Design a protein around this ligand. Structure first.
Ligand SMILES: [Mg+2]
Ligand SMILES: [Mg+2]
Lengths: 223, 215
């Protein structure tokens, strides 16, 4: 019936203590990572980073990023579900150090503008009933001098781990009386001036949905 | 429950009369298409795909690429409905015209001829996006996207033949061709590659019910 020998590839969801992700074996990185932030989550007893980055043995070795892929690349191991979101448990924080939760990030971005966006996201748990965060890579085309449009991204290491051109982050913010808002950001995988205000990187959710292949607003509007 | 507001992206399988496929909404193209070759329309956009992520005829028009069907129309003469389903653009990738009409057409005809010889013939076809090293020493994936909807142009295509011989023995024959004007006098056997190289590059693991493959 064509399934006799099984199908050649299906969605790879991974549920960890601190997040759920969907994994793309072609790029060797997550398609998206989903977290729920709340205030009890952000205060410690996790907050030992005595965790090291670890390859994800639940991913077939053909399609698995390793620490050796990153070494000498010039890229940081940039965690999509952030370690500091998950001080509420050591297991929760350790799970953020799986390389399936990680993408090659320009070090300036990882340390400054993206870190600021992560801190801002946590600060909103003081305001909203619930804060959900969906984070992931983008591979965005550009028009080159021949007039044609191309996607171009570096791959690093023997395992050809894809370097995203950009990153997105979608915030779902729950306030009282059933209010639901969506705020969504894109930054380039590049040094980003840390003194640029974060709301300059707001984009409409439709542009992220079109570019990423994902759908956000139908699921949320369904409640 | 983390997944309160659903999940932003799932596997997208589509069953048709003539094939099963898995659809990648980021590239706006199939990840793989699976069909059975048995001895015994115009192109339409696929309304089962969200419009944000759906290739259209306008995406191909004036692009210089042919609408290359992954499951080939000539595989599914056994039914009007089966052949019609090959003209959904979800079954289609941008193909260099010369490739579509000559060497990849010959590969498709050759695959059909194996139904003479084997008890069953299944075929898994799809795109590849293969990196290359540039003058700066670094390796890049680079591919054209065409149309308003940015339909990805594969750098290569793969075809895996799953050949069922006597005794239930399964033989795997794996081919890759560049998305380029391939010299059609080159014997098809020159495009054979080890299936592991396709699995590594594509993210796919073929025939996973075969826990221990032939030899
Ligand atoms: Mg981080
Ligand atoms: Mg056709």
């Amino acid at each position: 019936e064509l399934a006799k020998y099984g199908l050649p590839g299906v969605a790879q969801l991974r549920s960890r203590e601190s997040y759920v992700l969907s994994y793309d074996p072609r790029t060797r990185g997550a398609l998206w990572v989903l977290e729920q932030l709340r205030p009890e989550r952000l205060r410690g007893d996790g907050d030992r980073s005595a965790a090291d980055f670890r390859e994800d043995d639940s991913v077939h070795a053909y399609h698995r990023a390793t620490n050796a892929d990153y070494r000498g690349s010039g890229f940081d191991r940039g965690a999509l579900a952030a370690a500091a979101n998950h001080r509420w448990s050591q297991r929760a924080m350790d799970d953020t150090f799986y390389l399936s939760n990680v993408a090659p990030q320009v070090p300036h971005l990882n340390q400054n503008a993206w870190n600021n966006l992560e801190r801002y996201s946590r600060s909103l748990t003081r305001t909203y009933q619930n804060v959900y965060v969906c984070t992931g890579p983008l591979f965005l085309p550009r028009t080159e001098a021949d007039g044609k449009s191309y996607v171009k991204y570096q791959v690093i290491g023997k395992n050809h781990v894809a370097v995203p051109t950009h990153f997105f982050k979608v915030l779902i913010l729950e306030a009282a009386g059933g209010q639901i808002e969506l705020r969504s950001y894109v930054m380039p995988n590049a040094p980003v001036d840390e003194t640029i205000p974060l709301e300059r990187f707001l984009v409409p959710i439709e542009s992220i949905e079109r570019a990423s292949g994902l759908l956000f607003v139908p699921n949320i509007l369904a409640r």
